[PDB]
Amino acid sequence: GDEEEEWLY
Amino acid sequence: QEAQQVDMWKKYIQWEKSNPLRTEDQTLITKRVMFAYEQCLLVLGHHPDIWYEAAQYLEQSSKLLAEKGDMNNAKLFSDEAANIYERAISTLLKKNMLLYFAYADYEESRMKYEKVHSIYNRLLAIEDIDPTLVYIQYMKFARRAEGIKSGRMIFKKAREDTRTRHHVYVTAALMEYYCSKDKSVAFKIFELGLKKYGDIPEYVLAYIDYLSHLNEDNNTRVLFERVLTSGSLPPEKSGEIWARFLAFESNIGDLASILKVEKRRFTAFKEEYEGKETALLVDRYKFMDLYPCSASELKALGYKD
């Protein structure tokens, strides 16, 4: 979710 | 056969394009050329090159009419080229990735991005299609025409599609390194991809390749050890990885590190490399197209590749 996307960028 | 018919038709079309009548009206030459294209496509509509070349010819004509200032016929032939793409993917070749992409690039070149989004998503909606390359091209368009953030969204959409294969991860990572010049994001994407596809030799080799060229010895060795010791890469699918490791040590290491790595490799393939120690030694010295042995010596050694 927004967690993987936050970790990436 | 069919190849003869295609060649006949293309030669007829080329003749018409040569303006044998020496008309000065480009609209008339274009009408005649497109007529020949139509007759051809009636019976060879399953050949994607004919659609593409016909659309390209119409676009070229549109540009020539624009240079001469005839904006009305230019706009007309521009829209008709778009319709050529639309007809091509609407019948016969409804699943031809190449024409979908060509269409997308044409509408991108006309600055009609909404139509580009529709085209890529139409293709993506066909269930029995491998969408990986589709996502790669879509991300390329998003990044170069709408910016990093649109690209990251397309990448998100790709990860959420269970049909997508590992290449998009590679692409996204390389994009972040090559376009945003951001090594940290590149790393994180490669690492997420590694969690998901660490058992795929082509993926692991892509990450290895990226990191090696960063030219930091310790990080490269660490990644080599991670992948070859832990991880999911089958031991029988790891030969190329060991090869890259031996080349890394040959470039930055000494003879001792090379021999350590060589022996670990042989252990890992003790069975497959029985009696092939000398054929392996060849690869300690080879560089580009220079070999330490003649072709006949190499064949007698059991040398491969």
Neighbours of B120 (CB within 10 A): 23
Question: Contact B188/A8, CB-based, under 8 Å?
Answer: yes
Does residue B115 contact residue B151 with C-beta atoms inside 8 Å? no
Between CA B149 and CA B187 the distance in angstroms is 18
Tell if the CB–CB gap between B152 and A4 is shorter than 8 Å. no
Task: Give how far B108 is from chain A: nearest CA, Å.
Answer: 27
Q: Are A5 and B188 a contacting pair at CB < 8 A?
A: no
Q: What span, in angstroms and rounded, lies between the C-alpha atoms of B246 and B253?
A: 9
Partner-chain contact A4 B188, CB within 8 Å: no
Experimental approach taken: X-ray
Measured between beta carbons, the chain B residues lying within 8 angstroms of A7 are 188
Token pair of B202, please? 């082509």
Resolution value (Å, 1 decimal): 2.5
- CA atoms of B174 and B18, how far apart (whole Å): 45
Question: Which tokens belong to B147?
Answer: 């910016």
With an 8 Å Cβ cutoff, the interface of chain B facing chain A consists of 152, 156, 159, 185, 188-189, 192
- Ordered alpha helix ranges (H), B160-276: 167-178, 183-197, 201-214, 217-229, 239-252, 255-268
**Nearest residue of chain A to residue B189 (CA atoms):** A8
Backbone angles phi, psi at B71, to 5 degrees: -75, -30
**Count of the separate structural domains present in chain B:** 1
Residue from the list B152, B156, B188 with its beta carbon closest to the beta carbon of A7:
B188
Give B-chain residues touching A8 at CB under 8 angstroms.
Answer: 152, 185, 188-189, 192
From chain A, the residues in CB contact with B180 under 8 A are: none
Query: CB of B204 within 8 A of CB of B194?
Result: yes
How far from chain centre, in Å, is Cα B256? 39
Contact status, residue B208 vs residue B227, Cβ threshold 8 Å: yes
The answer to whether A4 contacts B192, with C-beta atoms less than 8 Å apart, is yes
Nearest CA in chain B to A5: B156
d(CA B42, CA B132): 32
List the single residue in A with minimal CA-CA distance to B173: A8
Cβ-based neighbours of B59, under 8 Å, separated by 6 or more: B77, B78, B81, B106
b/e map of B172-185 (b: 16 or more CB within 10 Å)? Answer: bbbbbbeebeeeeb
Nearest CA in chain A to B153: A5
Q: Provide the residue range defining the domain that includes B129.
A: 1-305
A9–B156 CB contact, under 8 Å: no
CB contact under 8 A, B192 and A5: no
CA pair distance B113, B142, nearest whole angstrom: 9
